[PDB]
């Protein structure tokens, strides 16, 4: 069993909580408390390896908690999530990446760019621009739908694979 510490970041309403709950518990959730920042644990098999995922589903917080501080110190990879129908959430991505680099004091932090809500045919964010933003960063771009489940495992499993790539290097 190998432990991986992941952190899910992104603007309010992009689907961080929905993605986390769909991954862990197999439910699509319409209204999960937007203020709750909680940690979840799931045992999954990825490429034949038994992985223990510790996932921080982040939220807007007024105080900097002991739980958040554990992930600040030992979090290994980040999912930077935007919604394909919210331009402002895509514009925040570069700020999330810049901040993660400073938090970890590293130009090489395992990260995946996630474009959520791809079940909606209405796209305000050009997915070609997202794939080019990810290419510019040297990271994978994954499309997801917490509603249909498409890409959900792919987003988190790709992040675990990026962490492995970082550990071996």
């Amino acid at each position, epitope marked *: 069993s190998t432990e991986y510490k992941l952190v899910v970041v992104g603007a309010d309403g992009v689907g961080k909580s929905a993605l986390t709950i769909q991954l862990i*518990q197999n*439910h*699509f*959730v*319409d*209204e*999960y*408390d937007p203020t*709750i920042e*909680d940690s979840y644990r799931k045992q999954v098999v990825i490429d034949g390896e038994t992985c223990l995922l510790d996932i921080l589903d982040t939220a807007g917080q007024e105080e900097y908690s002991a739980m958040r501080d554990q992930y600040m110190r030992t979090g290994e990879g980040f999912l930077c999530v935007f919604a394909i129908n919210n331009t402002k959430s895509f514009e925040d991505i570069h700020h999330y990446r810049e901040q993660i680099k400073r938090v970890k004091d590293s130009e090489d932090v395992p990260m995946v760019l996630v474009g959520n809500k791809c079940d909606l045919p209405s796209r305000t964010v050009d997915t070609k621009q997202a794939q080019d933003l990810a290419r510019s960063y040297g990271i994978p771009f994954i499309e997801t739908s917490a509603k249909t489940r498409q890409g959900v495992d792919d987003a988190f499993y790709t992040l675990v694979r990026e962490i492995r790539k970082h550990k071996e290097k």
Partner: antibody
Amino acid sequence: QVQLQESGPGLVKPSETLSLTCAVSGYSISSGYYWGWIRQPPGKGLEWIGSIYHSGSTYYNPSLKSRVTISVDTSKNQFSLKLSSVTAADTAVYYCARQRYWSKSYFRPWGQGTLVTVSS
Amino acid sequence: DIQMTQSPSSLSASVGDRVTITCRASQSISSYLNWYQQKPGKAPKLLIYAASSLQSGVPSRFSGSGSGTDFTLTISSLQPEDFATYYCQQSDSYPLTFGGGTKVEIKR
């Protein structure tokens, strides 16, 4: 201000379907919250049956799932329960209640409860 | 399912006594535990949510404590009107589950 009230037949024959409605006042089901059904057999504890969101998304007690249908009517501001193939084990006071969020929340307020007896 | 075990199933205590009822979860639920009070012929009423937050309007003699798998509801000075069955309920995850209840009666 927010009030919930159950209604429906107090007598159901074995094998037939139990139907109840919860009339909501002081708040619109279409605005938010999860809307649930909880039951209490005479002299026993509480058992959560299921909950629904205004979108139609339903969550169930796994031991009752195959028999439960929960529905919402946002125009009438009501929600309902259908429990098929009833037996004497379904004789209970049925309560409706609401909770703000899907999880990590609480039920408040609750209806007054309505007794349903399964008998021929 | 997360099983909730309450103890004791019933107790008798005098007016003014401190009463403690326990709730144990089969796995960790952090602070996602609520307590309801049920009087005869009435619906359960929320007293405490999130393990220790007192519902507005509820008398200060009621308090809740605990986290993880072990929780307690305490009535610091039992009053005659506190005769009820008390139920805990985990709100961490589905299916939503309740403890079996604790019936509190007054010794007079």
